[PDB]
Design an enzyme around this catalytic site. Structure first.
Site, PDB file in Angstrom:
ATOM      1  N   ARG F  54      41.155  43.018  18.631  1.00  0.00           N
ATOM      2  CA  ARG F  54      40.092  43.361  19.574  1.00  0.00           C
ATOM      3  C   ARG F  54      39.036  42.266  19.649  1.00  0.00           C
ATOM      4  NH1 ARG F  54      40.234  47.642  18.755  1.00  0.00           N
ATOM      5  NH2 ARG F  54      40.214  48.654  20.812  1.00  0.00           N
ATOM      6  N   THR F  55      38.724  41.769  18.462  1.00  0.00           N
ATOM      7  CA  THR F  55      37.706  40.773  18.181  1.00  0.00           C
ATOM      8  C   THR F  55      38.181  39.399  18.632  1.00  0.00           C
ATOM      9  OG1 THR F  55      36.693  42.001  16.387  1.00  0.00           O
ATOM     10  CG2 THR F  55      36.416  39.644  16.293  1.00  0.00           C
ATOM     11  N   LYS F  84      49.621  30.741   0.397  1.00  0.00           N
ATOM     12  CA  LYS F  84      50.796  30.183  -0.363  1.00  0.00           C
ATOM     13  C   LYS F  84      50.333  29.552  -1.692  1.00  0.00           C
ATOM     14  CE  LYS F  84      54.589  27.468  -1.334  1.00  0.00           C
ATOM     15  NZ  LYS F  84      54.787  26.200  -2.083  1.00  0.00           N
ATOM     16  N   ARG F 105      38.000  34.948  10.858  1.00  0.00           N
ATOM     17  CA  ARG F 105      37.974  36.246  10.207  1.00  0.00           C
ATOM     18  C   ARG F 105      38.762  36.104   8.903  1.00  0.00           C
ATOM     19  NH1 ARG F 105      38.359  42.451  11.433  1.00  0.00           N
ATOM     20  NH2 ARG F 105      36.763  41.965  13.015  1.00  0.00           N
ATOM     21  N   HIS F 134      29.617  40.908   9.839  1.00  0.00           N
ATOM     22  CA  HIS F 134      30.216  40.963  11.158  1.00  0.00           C
ATOM     23  C   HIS F 134      29.139  40.821  12.238  1.00  0.00           C
ATOM     24  CE1 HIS F 134      33.181  41.380  14.098  1.00  0.00           C
ATOM     25  NE2 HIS F 134      33.519  42.649  13.973  1.00  0.00           N
TER      26      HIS F 134
END
Ligand SMILES: Nc1ccn([C@@H]2O[C@H](COP(=O)(O)OP(=O)(O)OP(=O)(O)O)[C@@H](O)[C@H]2O)c(=O)n1
Ligand SMILES: Nc1ccn([C@@H]2O[C@H](COP(=O)(O)OP(=O)(O)OP(=O)(O)O)[C@@H](O)[C@H]2O)c(=O)n1
Ligand SMILES: [Zn+2]
Lengths: 153, 310, 153, 310, 310, 310
Positions: F54-55, F84, F105, F134
């Site tokens: 959505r972001t 990894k 994010r 956020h």
């Protein structure tokens, strides 16, 4: 043929009387088309001694009238039914259910991959008579079914 | 020795009427007078290269009911690249050195037959080799038909559902074609028809069969009503529901059913047999499942035990 | 006030009369307790006035009688309904719903991980009253809820 | 002003032979005289809730070729708007406040159409909705057909493979049944025949059609040979290998074909078309793919521009 | 017969004081004088629809210690879409035809109770049905308390950790509330408090309980110290460590502990009981685990064996 | 010259009521008079090491709307820089030599801030860092609030759902505690109450607040109703279904609400807001989402342009 063997008989002055429902279809129409969701006065006769021979359901809804399209909705469960538009105690109009264009929210799409199942949409089937076969086409997945199939909900 | 002694049970087509009767008479005997130390000190491998827990649970229970130890594996798991591994031939040769018999289910057809080329003198019992055979399913089916019906010839057998990919109806029909005077009714949808090759077999042995669009046509005539899961993946979810309703069995369809009529179903059922059908005496599919315990002990006993003194 | 002269509600020889059903419950009872699943004469009046004690529903079921249990089974919707059995045009007995012990086949456990959400099982709930509400213990879930929540919508 | 301006494209049946020709025309114009800044400053979303790499790229290139920017995702294996918890309705409700158009592919039939009720001003285009519609594929096929044969009327069109589940062949047939004088030849395995409803619809129009065992049969009567991959998973690997000898095409089959005849394939192909076909003048499946860019630009232009100046 | 004969063990709430004592007296007897051929020729299903190897390994060991064969499955695996499969009802009915009793763990609450509706006369023992019950955990717990403490009434029982989601503390408290004069100390963090409904039960039977912010408050008074895994997923990793330190047991906190004091812990431990606590005599959690072997044999013996002659 | 030029955006606490208003203002300007070529020739990276569709889309559209190009990835289930072996430090060290700005994010708290020490000249923007910040969500919420109510001061703001783990509600409260005269109503399950530190901070400022059992309670006192999805996984499905009767909102609840009142939701919603709310004038969660584009353009513009000319 107002159930008159005795007295205290069911009448009404204004509203709609839907007569000649096949036996056991009566309840379903109350369920399906949500006709009881009203503060108005309703009277119902189930398994009544039908006009000639057999039983029939009957529904009377005081000071509530319905549309040609409402009436028509019924053509799939009570095509023989007759709708009466009585006013001042008198039957001023007699309609019969004729096959509609579409049937909105009452039918379920037999296709399990149709998007309609999971979502906040109303169902919509397009109605098409295949000479007594009457085919219902789903608005979304566009598949087509015999009404016998789609009437298993 | 008994005729089955030390034999590999790979296909139903390799078994004779006699072989069939022998297995069934035995199952009958073991069902009535159990022998819980018969297979004492024997070790059997339960190699489910392809998972199938009902089949397995059934087999293994039989093993233990006869006194045998079990070792094995249910497989599905990290074999996705087990092809860069050893052959099935080599897997059999190793295992055949440890155990007294080998029960095995496997993804590829012919798998159990190959096994027998390498197990030496260890008998191999097929619990399923892809779309080919499942002989102990057919044998618990016959056993159940014979135990409820009283015979295996002169029956009215109706087979219903997916007849095209239904491997056990193909197998059962092949088995029943070995007995006499049987009459077949196939009630499948046209896309899932009894394959030609079966019909040809029947026509050749001059066995009566018929296609019906519905059950109700033949309900009054049938002795055994054999249902099959319609695989939906095998279909179009649309096409499925369009005909689904036609080949679903509800309690109310049996009203005219003969007193001896039994409803069989091999496998997991769904919507093909309604739950209300369960409360009736024609319902015999769970019973049919418990009968695989005796069909399967019969096999194990006969194959591993030179002489049986039931 | 089941007095109402005026062209409505008639008397019956035998059967059962469920009076003083609060409004919009009459259909709930029809639905939930599958009472139309019968071929006996059924009369339903909905939203009739209880004189002035609001608008009540009312159900008349010819040649049909119930049990104390079946009547107790109504205590949650219509805790103040009255059930009149009738034989030969007269009311040989009244009854009120008494809240039962357990409650079978009509409720639904709130708990979404309750196994009685998949399987061929009818729901059963133990019933027990509290200060201001009734608790319902699921047979399977074994969890207990206020009847108000188990009455999810 | 253009009839398709700010219209949704969901199903082929919602398009007229008029709308169809409109698209094909613009498509042909854009193929010749490119407009690389036609859709500048517009932002399109490419919502592949189902992944389809071939289709996805086609569209995005089409998008970029007219100068639009693109936002989107591919393969919602567990993406929170499809498969966690969020409704599609709400997804579209949300993305419709961000972009100027939406292209979506989705595993459920009717999904694009639903979108349409939550997308407000914003046109939504169907890039596949389950087994139902794929308008862009069909417009791709028509355009090609007409670019190579010069008309969409009076054709001898053969379709091969899975006419039962080939969502593309159904649509192609519908679309081409809007022009006059086309004659269809349906070569396919009986297990995969053209559905009846399609056959029916053809007949309430009076379009000549027939069914054929194999392609050699009509090889020299056809303008277009439209192959579809046979889904082997859709049948038994024994069953499948039995029929596929009559449905793969090789260049040797081509010895007798018209010079105008072209072989089409929606792609991907597995072994239905041998590679030796790839070098004959008839092979037109990679060009067909190529025309997907123009068919798709044409649509995007039409929908987002009130009128074309080409 | 014994009172437990042929009974289903589904919940602790269905067992009486007596039932409890009987199971425990038996466990005691079997612990001292084993009966390794008691359940000879019996076959038991170990259906772990939900994996739990310690629980399983314990159950199965008990089965074999009593002479029973075991068949079953630990499950987790390819059931992710086993919902398009058969019901649990049907799974039970099939299995109930093969085995002599059914032990089962399952993801949904109520699962074991439903099972008993379909197992016919086959007894069902609950090894765990979601967040609901785990009766044989509670029974090995009581057994251990009674065997170390000498009684089940007049105890100072301290329950520590996550008391909100801790299903076996809820169960144990319910069991102990059946005996007399017990005194409860709850030492949980406020977010993981003993649910109201339990406190209400206690208040009603007029049983003494108390909340403490720490162990050290009540250490000198407690007989049994029952610890519980704080599930961290149940928390915020921040919130976790902010209070973690408060409800972690280290050897040095026991210095003032009564001689009879036992530290119990049902399940896998982590940081809640430090390793140094192991070298002390109050540490009784491994012992508590070995006691499930006798709590569980007691059940099996009683339920399957009409008369026990210990 | 603009106070935010080439500044990092990580946490809301690093923004002043001044910086805040600056953003909201530009945002309002860009909403009216678009600058589609503002950020031409700049390349931004969209580094979703945690996916959030959505972001992600919000940002990229915001990006494209100002004319920047975008490079990036989504969902690092095992991507070599996250999971990894490579450090985040080195990733940023590397990507900071490629782009003009970074949006990331990340599943760990403080991750954006770390980046900041390895990104050199290149500003980094926080699109979520674990449970912590956020900022973009909050700027989205303020802008909306102020666009619908005309001020950010003296509001009667109600927040509902999970105030304990709702990282959005915490931030929203902080941000709005920088303006004067706001009064908060906190409706939530006790298991989910507003953290104390938030309550504390409110009080060392003197902002009127209170806690409420349910939303009907304050329905007519509120300007803004800010709903948050209740994480059901965050509690017992029994426990959860018991409380959620007092926290879902339906239109019927709305009968008494102010005409100015608007319902906000950061999305996605499950069943906390009934669909019937969607058609009332109060429903403002899809518009709220829509304003995420402008809030986000405003930020990107501010950070990458020395001064705004609008
Ligand atoms: N004010 C009125 C008038 C009539 N009736 C109902 O209206 C229905 C239609 O009665 P009517 O059409 O006038 O004569 P019918 O002979 O029954 O018409 P039909 O062929 O439909 O029997 C009857 O069932 C009657 O009970 C009523 O309840 N209230
Ligand atoms: N053969 C009969 C007997 C009774 N009634 C119905 O059965 C109920 C009898 O209750 P009633 O004796 O008349 O007392 P009511 O005057 O309404 O007072 P109550 O309200 O206390 O039940 C009434 O609703 C009446 O309509 C009927 O229709 N046919
Ligand atoms: Zn549909």
């Amino acid at each position: 043929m107002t159930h008159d063997n005795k007295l205290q008989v069911e009448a009404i002055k204004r509203g709609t009387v839907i007569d000649h429902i096949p036996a056991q279809i009566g309840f379903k129409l109350l369920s399906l088309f949500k006709l009881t969701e009203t503060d108005q006065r309703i009277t119902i006769g189930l398994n009544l001694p039908s006009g000639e021979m057999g039983r029939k359901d009957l529904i009377k809804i005081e000071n509530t009238f319905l549309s040609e399209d409402q009436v028509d909705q019924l053509a799939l469960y009570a095509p023989q039914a007759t709708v009466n538009r009585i006013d001042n105690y008198e039957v001023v109009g007699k309609s019969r259910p004729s096959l509609p264009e579409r049937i909105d929210n009452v039918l379920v799409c037999p296709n399990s991959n149709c998007i309609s199942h999971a979502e906040p949409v109303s169902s919509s089937f397009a109605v098409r008579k295949r000479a007594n076969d009457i085919a219902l086409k789903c608005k979304y997945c566009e598949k087509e079914f015999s009404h016998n199939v789609v009437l298993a909900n | 020795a008994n005729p089955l002694y030390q034999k590999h049970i790979i296909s139903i087509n390799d078994l004779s009427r006699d072989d069939l009767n022998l297995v069934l008479a035995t199952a009958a005997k073991l069902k009535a007078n159990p022998q819980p130390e018969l297979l004492k000190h024997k070790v059997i491998a339960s190699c489910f290269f392809a998972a199938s827990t009902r089949t397995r649970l059934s087999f293994e229970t039989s093993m233990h009911r006869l006194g045998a130890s079990v070792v094995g594996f249910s497989d599905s798991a990290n074999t996705s690249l087990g092809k860069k591994g050893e052959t099935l031939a080599d897997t059999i040769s190793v295992i055949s050195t440890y155990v007294d018999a080998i029960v095995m289910r496997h993804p590829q057809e012919g798998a159990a037959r190959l096994a027998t080329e390498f197990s030496g003198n260890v008998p191999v019992l097929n619990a399923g080799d892809g779309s080919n055979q499942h002989p102990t399913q057919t044998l618990l089916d016959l056993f159940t038909i014979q135990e409820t019906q009283g015979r295996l010839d002169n029956l009215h057998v109706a087979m219903v559902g997916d007849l095209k990919y239904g491997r056990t109806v193909h197998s059962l029909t092949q088995a029943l074609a070995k007995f006499d005077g049987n009459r077949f009714y196939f009630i499948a949808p046209d896309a899932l028809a009894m394959p030609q090759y079966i019909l040809d077999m029947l026509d050749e042995k001059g066995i009566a069969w018929s296609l019906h669009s519905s059950i109700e046509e033949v309900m009054a005539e049938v002795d055994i009503l054999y249902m099959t899961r319609v695989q939906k993946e095998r279909l179009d979810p649309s096409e499925y529901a369009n005909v689904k309703a036609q080949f679903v069995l509800r309690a109310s369809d049996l009203h005219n059913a003969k007193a001896n009529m039994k409803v069989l179903h091999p496998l997991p059922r769904v919507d093909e047999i309604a739950t209300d059908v369960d409360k009736t005496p024609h319902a015999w599919y769970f019973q049919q499942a418990g009968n695989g315990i005796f069909a399967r002990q019969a096999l194990l006993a006969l194959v591993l035990n030179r002489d049986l003194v039931l």
